[PDB]
Design a binder for these strands. Sequence first.
RNA 1: GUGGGAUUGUGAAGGGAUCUCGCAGGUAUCGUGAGGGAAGUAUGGGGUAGUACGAGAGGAACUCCCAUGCCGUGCCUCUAGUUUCUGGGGUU
Length: 137
Amino acid sequence: KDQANVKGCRFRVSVALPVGAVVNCADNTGAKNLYVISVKGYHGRLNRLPSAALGDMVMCSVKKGKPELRKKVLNAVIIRQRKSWRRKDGTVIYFEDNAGVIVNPKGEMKGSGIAGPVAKESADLWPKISTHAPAIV
RNA sequence: GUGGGAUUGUGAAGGGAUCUCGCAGGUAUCGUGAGGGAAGUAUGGGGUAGUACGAGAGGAACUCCCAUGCCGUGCCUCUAGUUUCUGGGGUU
Ligand SMILES: [Mg+2]
Ligand SMILES: [Mg+2]
Ligand SMILES: [Mg+2]
Ligand SMILES: [Mg+2]
Ligand SMILES: [Mg+2]
Ligand SMILES: [Mg+2]
């Protein structure tokens, strides 16, 4: 689909990363980590922090990395999370780290390589990431 | 009428009068429903369709399917949390 609207095409996934979380960057663009600012498609509720999960597009900024990428607001897609989630076939699964990839507002991926596995929930929603994924788990 | 009690404060025994109360319900189920409360609410995707309209740039919507947010009422098969079963083990 390659669109920021994912709730209507993705099953429920337990939320993992509230605002202020720092995750690894799995691309080869020179960024080393990403800081979560907000989540696309979040409707508000008093006192509740926005929280992201697999396959979500977030607004972020680079804290450690090449100076040409820092002090700006960018778009990223979450591909790995440590919070365990349950699939409809009854399997509970989780990763070892939290990782995302910097992309375009239209979902086009900046960079040309991905390190580590990529979740199927993200691969199905974003095809270019699925193209560059070394392994889809 | 019947059965119980009791009369005003100064000793005991008998009678009389008067007054008050009781004289039919108890126990156990299944239901009715006047009146009162009152709740569900939003977004996206597929398809319609690169269609209608428009010189062109551009660019919709309903029946019908599939998901999600908030709210509400429960539940403990799975996953996670909690241990004064101090359960089993280890260690100063
Ligand atoms: Mg507050
Ligand atoms: Mg009524
Ligand atoms: Mg609903
Ligand atoms: Mg347990
Ligand atoms: Mg338990
Ligand atoms: Mg001991």
